[PDB]
């Protein structure tokens, strides 16, 4: 478990729960190539997105699918995402949770990064 | 010396008509009321205090935000928030709050 | 474990450790009498404050001792705590985790409720 | 119609000095440079763009975190903050965020 994704619904106090996410990581000639996606499960958790051999240095983006979370509980919000983009691994391999927290109008992120 | 602001996460407006009351810690650690008002229609709340009254000392800002959210029809978790804080060169004093029904933040803007 | 507080660091991108947790109740005279105390662990969590048969209904306000975090830290923080108040089990028992997110000058805290 | 503020966590200030830039995304689904400036003392960046100019679609505001804590001496996590929304009567956008090293959070003023 290098990557880990936790998101939270600041509406309903609760996981956000089949959150669709989508990892991208920057190609030699400085596009995004896919790397991994998943969905959240019911503790609004999303393990198993990479493996230690396959989580190699270069910059990462997190695209959390946040319109499609708040258009499945019938509301219209705001942003397309929840993102970060961040440099992984220059000093050796870290574990990484970013963990996310939902309101239809707001996000927040955090990263929580550990040595392993 | 003194400003409150305040943000809706889920409307995405300023939050308007919110009560905020400030309290000053006194020398037996009760609560004494300093300031009080309500946030205008851009979520701020100005002439709270002046620079005579604003002291060093500890401050309690207490924002009503389960009457807000329960004006608006939305349920909440928070009886209120209570942001406690030290005063302590010139200096102006922001505080500035996000809100969501299971969740707030706030932060210090000191200029 | 009916009540959990998580406490993370949004400077160094760490579990916050050793924070020190304070938790009350409103007593029938209307004072904070209190209820449990602890601190954090290496992950940042701290677990048995206390029991389903302690954990009644009332509000509560658990108090998180952000000042002495910081100060331990060798950083001179803004707030005296972080904090949540809330009417706890009033539609029967729930579980309730605390997420707070420190920096030096702000916080931010979130509640997980579920029903179990 | 589109105002960026931003706020240090950290320093319990205006984010000075930071470096923004807006896009819309075109067609083929690419990010088309729309507007860009640096935020001013107090933290905020105005005139981006005109009424005339800005039509609904999607929006990408890029705040470039990185830039803005090396500057200050502090080590950063993100490579910038990406803040990405769908414009669609009368509606004014402020696009605030608030940063730490290793957080930020943002939400959408619409009024
Ligand atoms: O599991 C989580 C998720 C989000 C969190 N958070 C992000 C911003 N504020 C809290 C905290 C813990
Ligand atoms: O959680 C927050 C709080 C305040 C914010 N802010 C208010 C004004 N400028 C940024 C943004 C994000
Ligand atoms: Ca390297
Ligand atoms: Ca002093
Ligand atoms: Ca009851
Ligand atoms: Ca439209």
């Not at 503790?43 to 499945?72: C, M, N, P, Q, R």
């Not at 927290?101 to 392993?116: D, G, R």
Request: aromatic share 10%; glycine share 6%.
């Amino acid at each position: 478990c290098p990557l880990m994704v936790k998101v939270l619904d600041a509406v309903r106090g609760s996981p956000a729960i089949n959150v669709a996410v989508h990892v991208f990581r920057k190609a030699a000639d400085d596009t995004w190539e896919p790397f991994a996606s998943g969905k959240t499960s019911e503790s609004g958790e999303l393990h198993g997105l990479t493996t230690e051999e396959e989580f190699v240095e270069g910059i990462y983006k997190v695209e959390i699918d946040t319109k499609s979370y708040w258009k499945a509980l019938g509301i219209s919000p705001f942003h397309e995402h929840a993102e970060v983009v961040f440099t992984a691994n220059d000093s050796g391999p870290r574990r990484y949770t970013i963990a996310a927290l939902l309101s239809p109008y707001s996000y927040s992120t955090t990263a929580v990064v550990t040595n392993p």
